[PDB]
Design a protein around this ligand. Structure first.
Ligand SMILES: CCc1c(C)[nH]c(=O)c(I)c1Oc1cccc(/C=C/C#N)c1
Ligand SMILES: [Mn+2]
Lengths: 427, 552
């Protein structure tokens, strides 16, 4: 806009220094993109060009949010975050409503565009610096630094939190049962209204924002449903399952009781009381593998009992909010992916399984990235904080292609993994 | 002379104050020699006499490294740098030729006295203080400080290029055609016009720069086509590296080998075939710079294989943004792959190799993928895009491995090439056991301390066997075992192991390996008609193990 607001002074952590992260190499297509986007921002004052006395740097990517005919700039403030909002997790911490996961329909609104109005503390600016790349190293990166609260930076919501709760006030007044969590550029309006009335209450809210603080969200559909139209409605209350299910069968064999003594034996690590010596003893012999054998009646009390210790959850499993959440995903096959979200080995706080298209646009990567954004968003709703993904995939391939099907404005933390061995039998 | 450019303001790391290091006098003949130069310097404005207030100091030196003519000034600024704030990394990369545009006329330009031509942050000058010594060591002191980018300071190359860019901005805009790579003191101008108008633009540029203290080659763009540049032979329609001569002795040391291999890689950009598995496969666990390293048989042959290649000359072609980038890969053998990128079947934009991970049992498919990956990255850095791949693998052999493979993988678009060897699966394991198949409950176990072991089995059909082994390990034995099951089993077999490790290895499908044994095994899986390996828990879990775990 054109309104000089005072500037919330920002300080990084104790004896911490700005981020100096390498800017990954992009496609000419994407350079060209960013180039224009920035050429514009500079034109709107949102950003500025720097000199070489700015040692700092944070990576930038180009993506398409709503598939749209045009791109979005996605700055990866992941490092600058740890070096700041982690004291803008305190100095300005945003509290997480433990009941939003409880609503029936959580819709998500993009508000990151409010920020662009608040000028950024001059002394901090030097840290928001990013660099638009060159191809084959001809010219030197184009250098920019922010003059307004940036987007991927968690210091932005934090600072805005004031203007926000204000705007959202003569609305939580009216609608008091709706819960509204703000996590970065995303608003998370949750309700219990009937699918459609809710969808209405949203547009209601959405129009309020626009009416009130000029804060603009977005229109999903153009009121035109091409059989391929959404809006982003989440339904948390229906988020539980117990995928771990011993097989159900009439006739068993050595191979079958065996593969079973395995998965079962291995569950012991995660489920307190389940021994299986009387069921497994039925194997102590060197019988053929195809050989069919009936399940001892005596032992079957274990299959029975265990079949049941696999209906009722674990115990000493609580949420440590000092610890960070870890999400392990496994390639399942035919477009299906299993995932656990834990904190301490074998004490999961949730388990799911994405899948969206078996063999059409079936591309390991695209799937993985979409599953990553799902697992994320869920947790952002359940615990108000994103996990760190142990991703089953080659570091470089991932680094090359994630930006391809990514549509989130935030980015989590990840690391690549050795191999899910006997852990695949979690289907 | 000095430019009207504004100055990049510099600061010293937090809390640090300028450097104070007094000058060690000596060689009074030099002592005047400095003042001699320094004078024609302050004259030109590069420095200035300073009142004894606010002084600091850095070591002043005078030397003559050449065919004697001019004594030269030297100001080791280390302790100064040590105190100067960090800057923006200067392009610590080099425009790779493979991605340069076949241009019509190309001119290079040696900006003279670069650093000196650009001023220095008014309030950071103090710290550039020094002092030429006394005639007699009684300190009359000749005080000076820099008003330009001091020859060896930290923040110099940065701010130089910083200034170079700004300066070139209007021009690169007043004439959008002309391309200009800038590197250090050099300027590489490229254009698609006639030597007449190209030569005329230079002058424009050349004179535009001079309006900002930047002087250029007076012999009107002194260009030496082709240019020996950063280890590259740059012609206006081909590129290479000339000084590629690899030495032959009869006594090689860790050091000599290093140098050799390095050179051998560099060659790779363009010489189809350079292999290197053998020579580097020598430098291990031992990092003794000057230690006598006995050349190996393969090293000698590989070194020989490279010579015949290198012996002959091979050129490179530039990039046509108009066509499509094609990259093709061929598999050498000992875990080696080579490839080359093109747009024309005889031409080549660049070439290169890829070597397997250094330590694991791998796979020709995974590798082929690891390769396709490498190139995709390289390709992005150089040209701006990805290339179409021509791979020695059938869409069916691939889609089968990724659909089996526990890990995500997205290989861009490729087409099949029938040029062998052909990547493939040398054996698939049965998903469900074999009815009518013999069941071998294999097992191993070695004495860790005594280094002795045992590998054996016990079949359903009553057949047993316990073979002794020496210098083995829990794992060695646990494969030693399977190998046994496959050795005594009929064309169809079911094997049961208590070791995820042994399983896992095989389960991977390695076709080659640095493990005589695993090869002993791979070779036998292939001969089999149908193999079913399955895993059962170790000690508590004791299926048919009650029999194996014991004896063995
Ligand atoms: C002649 C090669 C060339 C090509 C193919 N295309 C260009 O646009 C330019 I400028 C080039 O000149 C260059 C490129 C890289 C370095 C130099 C400087 C040479 C030296 N010393 C000149
Ligand atoms: Mn064993």
């Amino acid at each position: 806009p054109i309104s000089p607001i005072e500037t919330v002074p920002v300080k990084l952590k104790p004896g911490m220094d700005g981020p100096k992260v390498k800017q990954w190499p992009l496609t000419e297509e994407k350079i060209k993109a960013l180039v224009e986007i920035c050429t514009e921002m500079e034109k709107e004052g949102k950003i500025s060009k720097i000199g070489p006395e700015n040692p700092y740097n944070t990576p930038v990517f180009a993506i398409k949010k709503k598939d749209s005919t045009k791109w979005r700039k996605l700055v990866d403030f992941r490092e600058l975050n740890k070096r700041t909002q982690d004291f803008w997790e305190v100095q300005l911490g945003i509290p997480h409503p433990a009941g939003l996961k409880k609503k029936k329909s959580v819709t998500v609104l993009d508000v990151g565009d409010a920020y662009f109005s608040v000028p950024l503390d001059e002394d901090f600016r030097k840290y928001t610096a990013f660099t638009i790349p060159s191809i084959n190293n001809e010219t030197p990166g184009i250098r920019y630094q922010y003059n307004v609260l940036p987007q991927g930076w968690k210091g932005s919501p934090a600072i805005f939190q004031s203007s926000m709760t204000k705007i959202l006030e003569p609305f939580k007044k009216q609608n008091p049962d709706i819960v509204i969590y703000q996590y970065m550029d995303d608003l998370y309006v949750g309700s219990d209204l009937e699918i459609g009335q809710h969808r209405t209450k949203i547009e209601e809210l959405r129009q309020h924002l626009l009416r009130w603080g000029l804060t603009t969200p977005d229109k999903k559909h153009q009121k035109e449903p091409p059989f391929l139209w959404m809006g982003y409605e989440l339904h948390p209350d229906k988020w539980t399952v117990q995928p771990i299910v011993l097989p159900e069968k009439d006739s068993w064999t050595v191979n079958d009781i065996q593969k079973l003594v395995g998965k079962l034996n291995w569950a012991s690590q995660i489920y307190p009381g389940i021994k299986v010596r009387q069921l497994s003893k039925l194997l102590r012999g060197t019988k053929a593998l195809t050989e069919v054998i009936p399940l001892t009646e005596e032992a079957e009390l274990e299959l029975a009992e265990n079949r049941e210790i696999l209906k009722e959850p674990v115990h000493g499993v609580y949420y440590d909010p000092s610890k960070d959440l870890i999400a392990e995903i496994q390639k399942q096959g035919q477009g299906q992916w299993t995932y656990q979200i834990y904190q301490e080995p074998f004490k999961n706080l949730k388990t799911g399984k994405y899948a969206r298209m078996r063999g059409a646009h079936t591309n390991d990567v695209k799937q993985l990235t979409e599953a990553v954004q799902k697992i994320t968003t869920e947790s952002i709703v359940i615990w108000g904080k994103t996990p760190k993904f142990k991703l089953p995939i080659q570091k470089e391939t991932w680094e090359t292609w994630w930006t391809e099907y990514w549509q989130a404005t935030w980015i989590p933390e990840w690391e690549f993994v050795n191999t899910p061995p006997l852990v695949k039998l979690w289907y | 002379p000095i430019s009207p450019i504004e100055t990049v303001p510099v600061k010293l790391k937090p809390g640090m104050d300028g450097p104070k290091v007094k000058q060690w006098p000596l060689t009074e003949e030099k002592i005047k020699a400095l003042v001699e130069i320094c004078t024609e310097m302050e004259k030109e404005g590069k420095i200035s006499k300073i009142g004894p207030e606010n002084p600091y100091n850095t070591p002043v030196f005078a030397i003559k490294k050449k065919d004697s003519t001019k004594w030269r000034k030297l100001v080791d600024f280390r302790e100064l740098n040590k105190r100067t704030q960090d800057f923006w990394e200067v392009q610590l990369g080099i425009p790779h030729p493979a991605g340069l545009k076949k241009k019509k006329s190309v001119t290079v330009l040696d900006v003279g006295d670069a650093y000196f031509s650009v001023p220095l942050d008014e309030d950071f000058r103090k710290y550039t203080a020094f002092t030429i010594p006394s005639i007699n060591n009684e300190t009359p002191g000749i005080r000076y400080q820099y008003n330009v980018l001091p020859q060896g300071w930290k923040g110099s190359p940065a701010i130089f290029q910083s200034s170079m860019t700004k300066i070139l901005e209007p021009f690169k805009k007043q004439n959008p055609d002309i391309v200009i790579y800038q590197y250090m003191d050099d300027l590489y101008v490229g254009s698609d016009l006639e030597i007449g108008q190209h030569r005329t633009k230079i002058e424009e540029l050349r004179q535009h720069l001079l309006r900002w203290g930047l002087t250029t080659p007076d012999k009107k763009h002194q260009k030496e086509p082709p240019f020996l540049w950063m280890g590259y032979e740059l012609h206006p329609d081909k590129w290479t590296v000339q000084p590629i001569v690899l030495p032959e002795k009869d006594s090689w040391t860790v050091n000599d080998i290093q140098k050799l291999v390095g050179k051998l890689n560099w060659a790779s950009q363009i010489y189809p075939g350079i292999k290197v598995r053998q020579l580097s496969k020598l430098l291990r666990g031992t990092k003794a710079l000057t230690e006598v390293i006995p050349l190996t048989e393969e090293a000698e042959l590989e070194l020989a294989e490279n010579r015949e290649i290198l012996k002959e000359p091979v050129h490179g072609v530039y990039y046509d943004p108009s066509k499509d980038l094609i990259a093709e890969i061929q598999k050498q053998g000992q875990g080696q792959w080579t490839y080359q990128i093109y747009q024309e079947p005889f031409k080549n934009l660049k070439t290169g190799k890829y070597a397997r991970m250094r330590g694991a049992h791998t796979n020709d498919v995974k590798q082929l993928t690891e390769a396709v990956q490498k190139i995709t990255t390289e390709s992005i850095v150089i040209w701006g895009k990805t290339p179409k791949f021509k791979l020695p693998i059938q869409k069916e052999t691939w889609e089968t491995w990724w659909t089996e493979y526990w890990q995500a993988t997205w290989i861009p678009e490729w087409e099949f090439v029938n040029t062998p060897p052909l990547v493939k699966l040398w054996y698939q394991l049965e998903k469900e056991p074999i009815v009518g198949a013999e069941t071998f409950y294999v097992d191993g176990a070695a004495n860790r301390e005594t280094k002795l072991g045992k590998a054996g089995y016990v079949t359903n059909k009553g057949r047993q066997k316990v073979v002794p082994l020496t210098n083995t390990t829990n794992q060695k034995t646990e494969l030693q075992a399977i190998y046994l099951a496959l050795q005594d089993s009929g064309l169809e077999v079911n094997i049961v192991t208590d070791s995820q490790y042994a399983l896992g290895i095989i389960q991977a499908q390695p076709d080659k390996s640095e493990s005589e044994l695993v090869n002993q095994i791979i070779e036998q899986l292939i001969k089999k008609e149908k193999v079913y390996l399955a895993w059962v828990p170790a000690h508590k879990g004791i299926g048919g193990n009650e029999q194996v775990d014991k004896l063995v």
